[PDB]
Amino acid sequence: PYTVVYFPVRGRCAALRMLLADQGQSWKEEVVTVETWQEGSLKASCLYGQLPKFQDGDLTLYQSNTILRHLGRTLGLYGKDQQEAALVDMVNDGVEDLRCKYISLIVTNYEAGKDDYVKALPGQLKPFETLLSQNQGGKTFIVGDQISFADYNLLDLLLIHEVLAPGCLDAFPLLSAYVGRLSARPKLKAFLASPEYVNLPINGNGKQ
Amino acid sequence: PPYTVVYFPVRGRCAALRMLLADQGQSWKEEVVTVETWQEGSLKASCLYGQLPKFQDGDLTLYQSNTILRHLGRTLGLYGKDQQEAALVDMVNDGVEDLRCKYISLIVTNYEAGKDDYVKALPGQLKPFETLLSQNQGGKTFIVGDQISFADYNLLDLLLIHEVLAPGCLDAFPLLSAYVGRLSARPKLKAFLASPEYVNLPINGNGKQ
Numbered sequence A: 001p002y003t004v005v006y007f008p009v010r011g012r013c014a015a016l017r018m019l020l021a022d023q024g025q026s027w028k029e030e031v032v033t034v035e036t037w038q039e040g041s042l043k044a045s046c047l048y049g050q051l052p053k054f055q056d057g058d059l060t061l062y063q064s065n066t067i068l069r070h071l072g073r074t075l076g077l078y079g080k081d082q083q084e085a086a087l088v089d090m091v092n093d094g095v096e097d098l099r100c101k102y103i104s105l106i107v108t109n110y111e112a113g114k115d116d117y118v119k120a121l122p123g124q125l126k127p128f129e130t131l132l133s134q135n136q137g138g139k140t141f142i143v144g145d146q147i148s149f150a151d152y153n154l155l156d157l158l159l160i161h162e163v164l165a166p167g168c169l170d171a172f173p174l175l176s177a178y179v180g181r182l183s184a185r186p187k188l189k190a191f192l193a194s195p196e197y198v199n200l201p202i203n204g205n206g207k208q
Numbered sequence B: 001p002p003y004t005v006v007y008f009p010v011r012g013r014c015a016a017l018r019m020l021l022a023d024q025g026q027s028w029k030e031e032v033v034t035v036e037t038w039q040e041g042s043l044k045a046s047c048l049y050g051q052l053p054k055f056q057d058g059d060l061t062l063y064q065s066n067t068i069l070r071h072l073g074r075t076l077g078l079y080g081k082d083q084q085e086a087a088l089v090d091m092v093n094d095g096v097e098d099l100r101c102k103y104i105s106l107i108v109t110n111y112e113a114g115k116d117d118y119v120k121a122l123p124g125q126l127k128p129f130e131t132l133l134s135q136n137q138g139g140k141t142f143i144v145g146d147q148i149s150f151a152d153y154n155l156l157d158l159l160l161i162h163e164v165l166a167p168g169c170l171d172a173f174p175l176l177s178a179y180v181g182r183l184s185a186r187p188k189l190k191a192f193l194a195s196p197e198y199v200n201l202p203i204n205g206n207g208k209q
């Protein structure tokens, strides 16, 4: 069974939770208070001193993208073949890059950086619109014709950017329609509407 | 195959995948991109994320160095023996990428002011890899399991460039030290590391190391 060990935020666990919910998998949440984290003991035991920590039976993993790839591999959300698997990675790596820029903004430079960030945003989102346009006219998934862990990550990234810069997908019809389509998947829709998702802040510092 | 690496004339983010290809007896073409070519803008606008490396494997075109590493890992069987090991391989590689990102940020943006703080923090950043080795066959084999993975090549490069940045940074870490020596001695890799193709490239594009 699966355990997610994280702070009481959506953050870097939002995509992997969406994945698990949408795939109908059961899991446990272990919540780490800022104070438990400050004590230092748990942090010292984490491979790279960070959360999330994830348990799959006796397998303990760190790094949100390691967890996504693991779930992608085990649950068959990693493309139909080797070529698609590579494209799934290429998408997820691009999502991670933009996520890192988003995190940097939220944590270190929200006030002085937001305008610079939002104006730079369309150029950062365009590659995903491009990928969609080259795959069945953008009517299905980011890679190929079945959902992948990259879809869940990309979906999260887009949802949080809509909160940051409302209407930012107006310039991107395929990304816009993709957000609506994936968000409407019944198990995912239910999860996104649920107190367990809605009552967590996006980020620890309460900015979004 | 065939394989083509499209990149600046630097080691940088292609060093690990080149070591991987060389050690695995694979052949590849280098397409070198000069400053003039990159500044012209055409190549850059054609890249998915506006970045190099670009990698060609037959009709497949890839961007993102870790995507290229994972692809070569997948297709060449350098990804652990099973799913549990593959997850550990990813965990190592994501850790390597995190420190590489920090290394690049120093080199490119903050070398003069930031070097002291970086080298001071370095031991705490390397210790996880020593720990991983200690928990896998007493550090006598690879970073994960009993066979080489793309993570080994990436970690090896990370360690090598760090020894340039902070000579002696592995002295306190016997497993990491022995690992660098052991992997660096693999005959095809040893030959590649000794070759002008590797030796005569700068680590980074701005001449800092």
Ligand SMILES: [Ca+2]
Pocket: A075, A076, A077, A078, A146, A147
């Ligand atoms: Ca599937």
Ligand SMILES: [Ca+2]
Pocket: A093, A097, B064
């Ligand atoms: Ca990247």
Ligand SMILES: [Ca+2]
Pocket: A167, A170
């Ligand atoms: Ca609108």
Ligand SMILES: [Ca+2]
Pocket: B076, B077, B078, B079, B147, B148
């Ligand atoms: Ca093998």
Ligand SMILES: [Ca+2]
Pocket: A063, B094, B098
């Ligand atoms: Ca990371």
